[PDB]
Every structure is written in structure tokens, then in C-alpha cells.
Amino acid sequence: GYVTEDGDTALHLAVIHQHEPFLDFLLGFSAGHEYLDLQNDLGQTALHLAAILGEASTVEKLYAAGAGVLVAERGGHTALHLACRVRAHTCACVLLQPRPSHPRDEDWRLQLEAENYDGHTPLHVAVIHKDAEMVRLLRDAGADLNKPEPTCGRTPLHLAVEAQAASVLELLLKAGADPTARMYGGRTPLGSALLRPNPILARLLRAHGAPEPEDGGDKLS
Amino acid sequence: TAELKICRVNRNSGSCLGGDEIFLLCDKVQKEDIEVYFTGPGWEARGSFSQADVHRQVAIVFRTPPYADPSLQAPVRVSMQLRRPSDRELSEPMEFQYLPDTDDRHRIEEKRKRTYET
Amino acid sequence: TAELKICRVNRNSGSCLGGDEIFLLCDKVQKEDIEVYFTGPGWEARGSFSQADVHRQVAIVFRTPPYADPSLQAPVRVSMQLRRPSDRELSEPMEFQYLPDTDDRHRIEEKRKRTYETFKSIMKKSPFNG
């Protein structure tokens, strides 16, 4: 029953200070309760703070103790969303599987396509932060490689071209991302590539589909 | 008769209270004959802007209409699209989500959970 | 004698780390002959975007360049204008303000210090030992 001026409970502060002992203590009996899900003023939960810190062990303890994984902080970000922008691969691993439970699953999957207020799902973030490793992870976890972001319909492949991430582009390409998709304006991943300074990208796409674009010079005004 | 199309927008979410300034890039429109139509089951509303807010008939800066429910307690998906009053033509709908909003910005209620439900 | 002109922006401030997406509504421009030029005393930078980000040569979407100083401790107002590399033509200066960063890692760290004592107490007074 304690809150900081910023809304952080003992649990929040246990992770902020990184007190595995006290965190272990807290989770002693708070496990299986909504205490775990309390949000400070930034709308963050202990799990959220754990993700940001990149502490895989911490993330597992909370997750194992029944911590809600789909809770959203002020940016609509889920713990996993936070992990993709911090490159916390191992935390992602902890979360991207069934919750821990000894010899005393579609649920952990729901995290895969949850989206923040930027219309981004974990994958969108991963690809934007050119986090190739996080892409392999999400791809293997089964994330929608074609899912368009809402501001203009950009797909992972579109985001990969905007980031000029070749390894990412290629990973997405070999995984089966449709190189035919176009954003609200009609532009396709190959088309955007041509308007970018990295030749490798166009070649990669050429080698996996290469449907040559149109033109319509931005349809001038 | 041309075609209504929403090319890009800066954000696809906002407060269920409305008032969020949205920047929308589109295909050529007619400033005196166009609007931003928001829709959900049994619900319609339009963005607020004036002809002055229609840049080169290729972009519109308007503000979102408040949602039907102000005490919204969970994200709500709705539709947003360009509309011509002249022929009632519409553009391909686009996604928009209304979100709950800091009720009187008071944790006295958020803490009557962090202490009550604690 | 063509003329650069910024008509509207959706935001006039952002993080000193740069990266903020701005929607700039302007007068007819040449997608391959244009840029968003940020300036201050002895400092200049360009917004980032591709010709694929110019909408009908009358609007531009780019991301702010990072401010000269990342550990900015107070807001610093700079100028932002359209610049045509062709003949070096510039637009009427518009004000853009850089703010101290909102980093989450640091946001947590600054909060760690700021609450060391309070924490040392809660666990002190708690049934926990250690």
C-alpha cells in the first residue's frame, strides 16, 4: 500500500533499484494478484520497467508470478513493445512463450500483434530499430510479416526500406513478406527503395519479386 | 468526378473527447466540397476545419470530433474517410481509435485502487 | 525568382535527440531540390526525409535533426526554414524549440537516485530482512 510521487509502488521501485532480493520478497505473496499490474503515472507496470531495463531474469520473475503482459503504458506500448525499441532480445524470449509454471498456447501469442498508439505492433518497432535479431525472434514466434501500419499502410518491408536495413529487408523477404503490397498512396517496397540511396535494397527486392513500379511522379500539384 | 483518397495521416488515435489536430494528406479535392467523416455502429461525426485548412486541395488540417462516449474506458476502433457532399462519394476508410482520457487528471481515483485494491 | 514558404507545421518543438516527425505544409517545391534547414549560433542541420516524402511538392514529412547538444538541460529556440540547394534560396524563418530529452532508461535512472532513501525505508520498515 505505498506509492511514490510518480505512482511507483514498492514493486516498481524494487525493479528501478534492481533489488532481486526485495523483488523476490514482494512477489512472495503479491503473486496472483492485481498488485503486479498497478501502473505508475507513466502508465507503466513493473513488467514495463523490467522490459526497459533489459533484465531478462526480472522479466521472467514477474511473468512467472502472473504479471499481465498486455498492459499499455502512456504510449500504448506493451512490455514487449518496450523490449523491441531497447533491443532486449532475451526479455522478448521470456515473454514470447507460455508463462512459467512447473509440473504442479494462444494467450502469450496475443502479444504478437498488439499495437501501440503509433499504430505499431512489436514487429513494426523491431524493423524500425533495424533490430534484425528481434525480427528473427518475432518471425519465429509467428508475427504477421505483412501487417500494415495505419498512418499510410506501410508494411514491415516498407519500414525496412525506410530504415535502409538490408539484412532486415532480406530476412523479411526470405520469410515470405509480400513485396507486392503498396501503401495508401500505391507505392510498393521496391518503389520506395528506388527513391533511397542504398542500391542493395532494390536488388534484394528484385531478386524476390522485382515487380517493377509505375511512376506517376508523385502526381504533382 | 475524380477519386477521394487518403494518402497519409500523422496519427490514427486520439482522445475520446475529440479535439486532436490531425494532418491528412490526400489526392486533389475541392475545399468547399469535402469533409472528414467519422463513423462507427450507429455513430457519425465530422472533423472540424474550414476552407482555409485545406492546403492546395491536397492536404487538410482538421480537429477530431469527440466520440459518442466521453467516459470511454477502453480503446474504440472507428472509421475515418474523405467525403464529398456534392455526390456523397466516400474514400476508402482508414483506421482510427478513440482512447479513454485522464478523467479530471486525478489519481485520487487511481490511488483508491493502489491503496484500496492494495 | 521562385520563393520558399512554410505555411504550416503540426508541431514547433521536440526532443534535442531529434527524430520527431513533422508535417510541413508549404508552397510548391521541387522534391529533388529542397530541404528543411535548422539553424542556431554556429550550428546548422537538415531534417531527414526522401523525395518520396514530399507530397505533391506542397508538403513535406521529415524527422527533426538532433540538436548540437544531447544533454540539453533547458529549452533552446532555433530557426527552421525551407532551403533550395539550387540557388541557396531560403524561406521566412520559423521558430523551432529543442527540449531536454525524454529518454526512458535515463528517466528511470534519474528516478532511481531521486528515490534511493525512500526505498531504503520502505524495505527497512517492511517484514523483509536484508
From Swiss-Prot, chain A:
Its job: Inhibits NF-kappa-B by complexing with and trapping it in the cytoplasm. However, the unphosphorylated form resynthesized after cell stimulation is able to bind NF-kappa-B allowing its transport to the nucleus and protecting it to further NFKBIA-dependent inactivation. Association with inhibitor kappa B-interacting NKIRAS1 and NKIRAS2 prevent its phosphorylation rendering it more resistant to degradation, explaining its slower degradation.
UniProt entry tagged with the keyword Cytoplasm: yes
Name of the protein this chain belongs to: NF-kappa-B inhibitor beta
Start-end of each ANK repeat: 6-35, 42-71, 75-104, 118-147, 152-181, 185-214
Tissue specificity note: Highly expressed in testis followed by spleen.
Gene: Nfkbib
Family per record: Belongs to the NF-kappa-B inhibitor family.
Full protein segment contained here: 52 to 309 of 359
Domain of life per record: Eukaryota
Assembly information from the UniProt record: Interacts with THRB (via ligand-binding domain). Interacts with RELA and REL. Interacts with COMMD1. Interacts with inhibitor kappa B-interacting Ras-like NKIRAS1 and NKIRAS2.
Nucleus among keywords: yes
GO BP terms in the entry: cellular response to lipopolysaccharide; inflammatory response; regulation of canonical NF-kappaB signal transduction
Gene Ontology CC terms: cytoplasm; nucleus
Keywords, alphabetical: ANK repeat, Cytoplasm, Nucleus, Phosphoprotein, Repeat
Organism, as annotated: Mus musculus (Mouse)
Main localization, broad class: cytoplasm
Swiss-Prot record, chain C:
Entry note about domains: The transcriptional activation domain 3/TA3 does not participate in the direct transcriptional activity of RELA but is involved in the control by RELA of the accessibility of target gene promoters. Mediates interaction with ZBTB7A. The transcriptional activation domain 1/TA1 and the transcriptional activation domain 2/TA2 have direct transcriptional activation properties. The 9aaTAD motif found within the transcriptional activation domain 2 is a conserved motif present in a large number of transcription factors that is required for their transcriptional transactivation activity.
Domain of life according to the entry: Eukaryota
Modification type Phosphothreonine: residues: 64
Tissue: Expressed in the myocardium (at protein level).
Triggers of expression: Induced in myocardial tissue by lipopolysaccharide-induced myocarditis.
Motif extent (Nuclear localization signal): 111-114
Subcellular location: Nucleus; Cytoplasm
A GO biological process held by the record: cellular response to lipoteichoic acid
Annotated protein name in UniProt: Transcription factor p65
One Gene Ontology term of the molecular function aspect: protein homodimerization activity
Knockout-associated phenotype: RELA haploinsufficient mice show cutaneous ulceration, epidermal skin loss and a predominance of neutrophils and macrophages in the dermis and hypodermis in response to TNF treatment.
Quaternary organization: Component of the NF-kappa-B p65-p50 complex. Component of the NF-kappa-B p65-c-Rel complex. Homodimer; component of the NF-kappa-B p65-p65 complex. Component of the NF-kappa-B p65-p52 complex. May interact with ETHE1. Binds TLE5 and TLE1. Interacts with TP53BP2. Binds to and is phosphorylated by the activated form of either RPS6KA4 or RPS6KA5. Interacts with ING4 and this interaction may be indirect. Interacts with CARM1, USP48 and UNC5CL. Interacts with IRAK1BP1. Interacts with NFKBIA. Interacts with GSK3B. Interacts with NFKBIB. Interacts with NFKBIE. Interacts with NFKBIZ.
Gene name, Swiss-Prot/TrEMBL: Rela
UniProt-reported outcome of changing residue 91 to A/E: Abolishes DNA-binding and transcriptional activity
Job of this protein: NF-kappa-B is a pleiotropic transcription factor present in almost all cell types and is the endpoint of a series of signal transduction events that are initiated by a vast array of stimuli related to many biological processes such as inflammation, immunity, differentiation, cell growth, tumorigenesis and apoptosis. NF-kappa-B is a homo- or heterodimeric complex formed by the Rel-like domain-containing proteins RELA/p65, RELB, NFKB1/p105, NFKB1/p50, REL and NFKB2/p52. The heterodimeric RELA-NFKB1 complex appears to be most abundant one.
Modified residue annotations for N6-acetyllysine: 28, 31, 120
Keywords: Acetylation, Activator, Cytoplasm, DNA-binding, Isopeptide bond, Methylation, Nucleus, Phosphoprotein, S-nitrosylation, Transcription, Transcription regulation, Ubl conjugation
Disulfide bonds: none
Major subcellular site: nucleus
Keyword Amino-acid biosynthesis listed: no
N6-methyllysine: residues carrying this PTM: 120
Residue numbers carrying Phosphoserine: 86, 91, 121
Organism expressing this protein natively: Mus musculus
